[PDB]
Design an enzyme around this catalytic site. Structure first.
Site, short mmCIF file in Angstrom:
data_model
loop_
_atom_site.label_atom_id
_atom_site.label_comp_id
_atom_site.label_asym_id
_atom_site.label_seq_id
_atom_site.Cartn_x
_atom_site.Cartn_y
_atom_site.Cartn_z
N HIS A 48 5.54 2.58 9.91
CA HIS A 48 4.25 3.36 9.68
C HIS A 48 4.11 4.03 11.26
O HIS A 48 4.81 4.37 12.19
CB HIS A 48 3.45 2.18 10.01
CG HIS A 48 3.58 1.19 11.10
ND1 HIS A 48 4.66 -0.17 10.95
CD2 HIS A 48 3.27 0.75 12.18
CE1 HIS A 48 4.65 -0.86 11.80
NE2 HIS A 48 3.76 0.03 12.80
N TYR A 64 -0.75 2.25 11.05
CA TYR A 64 -1.09 2.83 9.66
C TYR A 64 -0.22 3.20 8.52
O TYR A 64 0.70 4.10 8.95
CB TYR A 64 -3.01 4.18 9.31
CG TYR A 64 -3.46 3.00 9.81
CD1 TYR A 64 -4.53 2.24 8.31
CD2 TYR A 64 -4.51 3.34 10.74
CE1 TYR A 64 -5.65 2.06 9.78
CE2 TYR A 64 -4.71 2.92 11.72
CZ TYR A 64 -6.06 2.40 10.22
OH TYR A 64 -6.96 1.39 11.73
N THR A 65 -0.34 2.74 6.54
CA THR A 65 1.37 3.36 6.31
C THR A 65 0.63 4.72 5.37
O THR A 65 -0.48 3.95 4.87
CB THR A 65 1.75 2.66 5.85
OG1 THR A 65 2.30 1.11 6.41
CG2 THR A 65 3.29 3.16 4.87
N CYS A 244 2.47 -8.17 3.18
CA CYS A 244 1.35 -7.06 4.59
C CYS A 244 0.11 -7.50 4.09
O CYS A 244 0.03 -7.96 2.58
CB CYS A 244 1.71 -5.80 4.09
SG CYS A 244 0.78 -4.58 5.69
C1 LIG Z 1 1.81 -2.23 8.75
C2 LIG Z 1 0.36 -2.32 8.65
C3 LIG Z 1 -0.11 -1.01 7.52
C4 LIG Z 1 -1.76 -0.90 7.67
N1 LIG Z 1 -1.65 0.23 7.34
C5 LIG Z 1 -3.20 -0.39 6.66
C6 LIG Z 1 -3.57 1.48 6.00
O1 LIG Z 1 -2.91 1.81 5.63
N2 LIG Z 1 -4.58 1.00 5.87
C7 LIG Z 1 -5.64 1.11 5.72
O2 LIG Z 1 -7.11 0.72 6.02
N3 LIG Z 1 -5.15 -0.90 7.27
C8 LIG Z 1 -3.86 -0.78 7.26
N4 LIG Z 1 -3.58 -1.78 7.89
C9 LIG Z 1 -4.21 -2.55 9.17
C10 LIG Z 1 -4.78 -1.88 10.53
O3 LIG Z 1 -3.72 -1.90 10.98
C11 LIG Z 1 -5.86 -2.42 11.20
O4 LIG Z 1 -5.44 -3.59 10.62
C12 LIG Z 1 -7.63 -2.55 9.71
O5 LIG Z 1 -7.96 -1.06 9.99
C13 LIG Z 1 -8.34 -3.17 10.76
O6 LIG Z 1 -8.71 -2.46 12.04
P1 LIG Z 1 -9.78 -2.02 12.85
O7 LIG Z 1 -9.39 -2.20 14.57
O8 LIG Z 1 -11.04 -1.29 11.30
O9 LIG Z 1 -10.89 -3.36 12.87
P2 LIG Z 1 -10.92 -4.66 13.77
O10 LIG Z 1 -11.56 -4.47 15.35
O11 LIG Z 1 -9.01 -5.09 14.92
O12 LIG Z 1 -11.53 -5.80 13.36
C14 LIG Z 1 -11.40 -6.14 12.06
C15 LIG Z 1 -11.21 -7.97 11.97
O13 LIG Z 1 -12.04 -8.26 12.65
C16 LIG Z 1 -12.93 -9.16 11.33
N5 LIG Z 1 -13.98 -8.02 10.69
C17 LIG Z 1 -14.87 -7.36 11.44
N6 LIG Z 1 -15.71 -6.17 10.75
C18 LIG Z 1 -15.56 -7.22 9.41
C19 LIG Z 1 -16.27 -7.13 7.99
N7 LIG Z 1 -17.26 -5.80 8.09
N8 LIG Z 1 -16.44 -7.79 6.81
C20 LIG Z 1 -15.45 -8.45 6.89
N9 LIG Z 1 -14.57 -9.36 8.23
C21 LIG Z 1 -14.62 -8.37 9.38
C22 LIG Z 1 -12.07 -9.38 10.14
O14 LIG Z 1 -10.72 -10.58 10.49
C23 LIG Z 1 -10.97 -7.53 10.31
O15 LIG Z 1 -9.33 -8.11 9.99
C24 LIG Z 1 -2.20 -1.62 8.20
C25 LIG Z 1 -1.35 -2.54 9.14
C26 LIG Z 1 -0.55 -2.91 8.71
C27 LIG Z 1 0.30 -3.74 9.89
#
Ligand SMILES: Cc1cc2nc3c(=O)[nH]c(=O)nc-3n(C[C@H](O)[C@H](O)[C@H](O)COP(=O)(O)OP(=O)(O)OC[C@H]3O[C@@H](n4cnc5c(N)ncnc54)[C@H](O)[C@@H]3O)c2cc1C
Length: 271
Positions: A48, A64-65, A244
Site C-alpha cells: 500500500h 491506503y490501497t 483487513c
Molecule cells: C492496508 C490498508 C489499506 C487501507 N485502504 C483504505 C482505502 O483504500 N480507503 C480508505 O478509505 N481507507 C483505507 N484504509 C484505512 C485508512 O488507513 C484509515 O484508517 C481511514 O482512512 C481512517 O483514517 P482517518 O484519519 O480518517 O480517521 P482517524 O483519525 O484514524 O479516526 C477514525 C476512527 O475514529 C472513529 N470515528 C471517527 N469518526 C467517526 C465517525 N464519523 N463515524 C464512526 N466512527 C468514527 C472510528 O473508530 C474510526 O476508526 C486502509 C487501511 C489499511 C491498514
C-alpha cells in the site's frame, strides 16, 4: 518503459487531485495525477501507500490501497470512506485524514509515500511475507487464499484478486467474505460481481451485513465461525488467510473464529 512514481521509500511525493466522484453518502473515488501521463505508481501487489498531511498541527499518516494498478498510466485512483465530524457522539472531531481528503479542492496536493507492507504477491500462488520490516520474507506457495474484509478493508483484497484473475495461468482460488454495515455500504460491488461472474472457478464471493435489507440472499450479523467455515477454504488446503478491517473486527470476529475452524496463526496475515 514507464517512469516510476515511487522511486524512493524515503521521499514524499505531492500529487495533485484531478477528479472527485461520489460513490455513496460517505465514500468517494479520488483521482490524483502522477508526475507525467506516462508514469506508473510503482506499487507491488500486496503493498500500500501512505498519505500524509499536517492536520491540526501534527503530521498524520494513514495507509491506503489504490483501486488502480501499475497498468494504469498517469493517474492513481483511491476509494476513500469519510468519517464525518459531528456525527458520532464519542468521536465529535471525526476522522483526521479522511476529512482532509474530503476538503481537498481540484488541484490541491497531498503527499504519497511507499511502497509499504510486509506482504507481496509474487504470482502463481506465491506470497512473500516478512515477519517484520527488518527481516527477510518467508516464501510460501498456496493453492487458495481466504479473505475477510470489512468496509474499506476490501481494497487490499481487490488488489490481490485482480492480480490473480488477470493472469490466465494463475490457478489460485480466492474466497472472499466481505462484511459491511448496510447494503449501501458494500464498496466496489459491481467490480467484485463482474470478477465473480467472469472467474467463478477462481473467485468465491460472499457478503454479510450488520443490517440486511428485506430482500437479501447472503449473510446478516457479524462475521462468525460458521461463515468462516462455509465461505473460506478449509484448513486442510493450507490456505493463506488475509484480513483487513477495523481492529475490533479482527480481534473479535476474525481471530477467535479462525482458531475454532483451525486456521493456524502462521497461515494468517492482517493487512
Ligand atoms: C492496508 C490498508 C489499506 C487501507 N485502504 C483504505 C482505502 O483504500 N480507503 C480508505 O478509505 N481507507 C483505507 N484504509 C484505512 C485508512 O488507513 C484509515 O484508517 C481511514 O482512512 C481512517 O483514517 P482517518 O484519519 O480518517 O480517521 P482517524 O483519525 O484514524 O479516526 C477514525 C476512527 O475514529 C472513529 N470515528 C471517527 N469518526 C467517526 C465517525 N464519523 N463515524 C464512526 N466512527 C468514527 C472510528 O473508530 C474510526 O476508526 C486502509 C487501511 C489499511 C491498514
Amino acid at each position: 518503459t514507464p517512469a516510476i512514481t515511487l522511486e524512493s521509500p524515503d521521499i514524499k511525493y505531492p500529487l495533485r487531485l484531478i477528479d472527485r466522484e461520489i460513490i455513496s453518502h460517505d465514500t468517494r473515488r479520488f483521482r490524483f495525477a502522477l508526475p507525467s501521463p506516462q508514469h506508473i505508481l510503482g506499487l507491488p501487489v500486496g503493498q500500500h501507500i501512505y498519505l500524509s498531511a499536517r492536520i491540526d498541527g501534527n503530521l498524520v499518516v494513514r495507509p491506503y490501497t489504490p483501486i488502480s494498478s501499475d497498468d494504469d498510466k498517469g493517474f492513481v485512483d483511491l476509494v476513500i470512506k469519510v468519517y464525518f465530524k459531528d456525527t458520532h457522539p464519542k468521536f465529535p472531531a471525526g476522522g483526521k485524514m479522511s476529512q482532509y481528503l474530503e476538503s481537498m479542492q481540484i488541484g490541491d496536493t497531498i503527499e504519497f509515500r511507499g511502497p509499504s507492507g510486509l506482504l507481496v504477491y509474487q504470482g502463481k500462488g506465491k506470497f512473500a511475507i516478512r515477519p517484520d520490516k527488518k527481516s527477510n520474507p518467508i516464501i510460501r506457495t498456496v493453492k487458495s487464499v481466504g479473505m475477510i474484509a470489512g468496509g474499506t478493508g476490501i481494497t487490499p483484497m481487490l488488489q490481490v484478486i485482480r492480480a490473480i484473475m488477470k493472469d490466465p495461468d494463475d490457478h489460485t482460488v480466492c474466497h472472499l467474505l466481505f462484511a459491511n454495515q448496510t447494503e449501501k455500504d458494500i464498496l466496489l460491488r459491481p467490480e467484485l460481481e463482474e470478477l465473480r461472474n467472469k472467474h467463478s472457478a477462481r473467485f468465491k464471493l460472499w457478503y454479510t451485513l450488520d443490517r440486511a435489507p428485506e430482500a437479501w440472499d447472503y449473510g446478516q450479523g457479524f462475521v462468525n465461525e460458521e461463515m468462516i467455515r462455509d465461505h473460506l477454504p478449509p484448513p486442510e488446503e493450507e490456505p493463506l488467510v488475509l484480513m483487513c478491517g477495523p481492529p475490533p473486527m479482527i480481534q473479535y470476529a476474525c481471530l477467535p473464529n479462525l482458531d475454532h475452524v483451525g486456521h493456524p496463526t502462521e497461515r494468517c496475515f492482517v493487512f
